[PDB]
C-alpha cells in the first residue's frame, strides 16, 4: 500500500485527486446504467487492483475492475476521506443528537477545520457529486442514496460498531441534497 | 494570518510552495552576496510584508524580500517543522544525545503518514537555500551555524541542551546537503 495521502495527491486550485477523477469519469462512461455496479466481486485481487492504481487509459479496463479499484482506492488511502477525528466526534454524540441536519451541519464544520487539509473536504465533495449522478439513473443501476450510503460509508469513514446508523444516514442525505 | 497550510499550498510533483520559490529565487538573485542579508530589519511592518505575500518579486528591495521570507515562515498556520515533531525531539534524554540520532528521528517523524509530505519537502527546499547561502560565506558572512541560529526559531516555532540539539541538527542538515 503505497497510495499517498489525499493531501499529497493534489492541492488547490485542483478540485480532486487526478487518479480519482480518472476512475470516476471512466466508471461513469461505462457503468452509469449497470445494475450491479459497485456490488460485485470482480476477478482481480488487491495486488492486481493496486497495479492499476500505482501505475494507461482506464476506459480499457472492465467496468467491474474499475469499480473494484475505486473501492481499493478508498481502502488504501493512508487516512480515510473522513478523518477518524471527525468520525469519532460524530459517533460519540450519537445518543445525544438525533437531528440529521445538525449532524450534517457538524460534519461540514469538523471536516473544514484548519487542522485538516482542504483536500479531504474537496475529495468528499467530488465523491458525493459522483454518488449523486449515479442516483439520477437509479431506475436502471438500482443505486439510490440509501444503497450508495450503505456501500460506501464504511469506506469513507473506515469503520467495520452498532452506534453507527446515524453516520450512514448523513451520507444518504448528503447524496440526495446536491 | 491568512496564509494557507503548507499542505494546501502545493503538492507533489511540485517541490515547494510556489510563493516560497518566488521569494527564495528572488532573494538569491539579488542578495546572495549581501553581508547583512537576514541580519538587519527593513522599514516595512508585518502588515506591509503580508500585503506582498498576496507582480514579480525581483522588483522589491532585497531587505524587504528577506523580511517577507521571515514573515512567511512566521505566518504559516503550522511551522515548517510541526509541533508533533518538535515535541518528540525536545523530549529526548541525555543518553540519546547523538546528533546522528536526533536527525534520524526528525526524518522519521516528519516523514510520518500523519504529517503531509509537503512539510518535509518545504524544509528540504529551505535547507538547499541555506546551503547555497553558506557556499558564499566569504562574501555574505553566513555559515551553517549562524543560519541555524537565525532560522531555527522560525522553523520550529518553540532553552537547554535539548534546544541546543535542535539548532545543531539544523546546522548539520544545512552543511550536509551536498
DSSP conformation class of B34: -
Query: How many contacts, defined by CB atoms under 8 Å, are there between A and B?
Result: 41
Residue B165: enclosing H or E segment and its boundaries?
helix B163-175
Q: How far is B75 from chain A (nearest CA, A)?
A: 14
Residue where the block lists cell 538547499: B128
For residue A11, the chain B residues in CB contact (below 8 A) are 7-11, 118
| Interchain pair B113, A12: CB under 8 A | no
And the C-alpha cell for A154?
464504511
Nearest to residue B150, comparing CAs of B136, B171, B129? B171
CA B86/CA B125 separation, integer angstroms = 19
Structural method:
X-ray
In the three-class reduction of DSSP (H, G, I as helix; E, B as strand; rest coil), residue B36 is classed as: coil
Please count the other Cβ atoms lying within 10 Å of the Cβ belonging to residue A80.
19
Distances (CA, A) of A111 to A15, A74, A80, B9: 16, 17, 12, 18
Query: Is A170:A97 a contact under the CB 8 Å cutoff?
Result: no
Check CB contact under 8 Å for A7 and B77. Answer: no
Q: Using CA of residue A142, residue A19, residue A164, residue A168, what is the dihedral sign?
A: negative
Residue B127 is given by DSSP the state: H
The Cα–Cα gap between A151 and A132 comes to: 14
User: Coil, strand or helix: which one is B31?
Assistant: helix
Architecture of domain B1-178 in CATH? Orthogonal Bundle (1.10)
Tell me the domain boundaries of chain B.
1-178
Q: Cell 476506459 appears where?
A: A59
Tell me which residues of chain B, numbers 14 to 73, contact chain A at a CB-CB cutoff of 8 Å: none
A88-116 as b/e, with b when 16 or more CB fall inside 10 Å? Answer: eebbeeeeeeeeeeebbebbeebbeeeeb
Rounded CA-CA distance A149/A98 in Å is: 18
Non-local CB neighbours of A120 within 8 Å, separated by 6+ positions: A6, A7, A79, A81, A82, A83, A111
Q: CB neighbours of A143 closer than 8 A, spacing ≥ 6?
A: A37, A38, A131, A134, A135, A137
Q: Looking only at Cα atoms, what is the longest distance across chain A?
A: 49
3-state secondary structure chain A: CCCCCHHHHCCCCCCCCHHHHHHHHHHHHHHCCCCCCCCCCCCCCHHHHHHHHHCCCHHHCCHHHHHHHHHHHHHHCCCCCCCHHHHHHHHHCCCCCCCHHHHHHHHHHHHCCCCCCHHHHHHHHHHHHHHHHHHCCHHHHCCCHHHHHHHHHHHHHHCCCCCCHHHHHHHHHHHHCC
> Of B31, A120, A177, B14, which is closest to residue A169 (Cα–Cα)?
A177
- Mutation choice for B interface testing from A7, A84, A111, A121 by most B CBs within 10 A: A7
3-class SS of residue B43? coil
Quote the minimal CA–CA distance from B84 to chain A in Å: 13
Residue B146 parent element (H or E): helix B144-156
Helical (H) or strand (E) element with B85: helix B83-90
Cα(B60)–Cα(B122) distance, integer angstroms: 23
Alpha-carbon distance A54 to A74, whole Å? 14
The three cell numbers of residue A155 are 469506506
Amino acid at each position: 500500500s503505497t497510495l499517498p495521502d489525499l493531501a499529497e495527491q493534489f492541492a488547490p486550485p485542483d478540485v480532486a485527486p487526478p487518479l480519482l477523477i480518472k476512475l470516476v469519469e471512466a466508471i461513469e462512461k461505462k457503468g452509469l446504467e449497470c445494475s450491479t455496479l459497485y456490488r460485485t466481486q470482480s476477478s482481480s485481487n488487491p495486488a492486481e487492483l493496486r497495479q492499476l492504481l500505482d501505475c494507461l487509459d482506464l476506459e480499457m479496463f472492465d467496468v467491474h475492475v474499475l469499480a473494484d479499484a475505486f473501492k481499493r482506492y478508498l481502502l488504501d488511502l493512508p487516512n480515510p476521506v473522513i478523518p477518524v477525528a471527525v468520525s469519532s466526534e460524530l459517533i460519540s454524540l450519537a445518543p445525544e443528537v438525533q437531528s440529521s441536519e445538525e449532524y450534517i451541519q457538524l460534519l461540514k464544520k469538523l471536516i473544514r477545520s484548519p487542522s485538516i487539509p482542504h483536500q479531504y473536504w474537496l475529495t468528499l465533495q467530488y465523491l458525493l457529486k459522483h454518488f449523486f449522478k449515479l442516483s439520477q439513473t437509479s431506475s436502471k443501476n438500482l443505486l439510490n442514496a440509501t444503497v450508495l450510503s450503505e456501500l460506501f460509508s464504511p469506506l469513507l469513514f473506515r469503520f467495520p460498531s452498532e452506534n453507527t446508523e446515524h453516520l450512514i444516514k448523513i451520507i444518504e442525505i448528503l447524496i440526495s441534497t446536491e
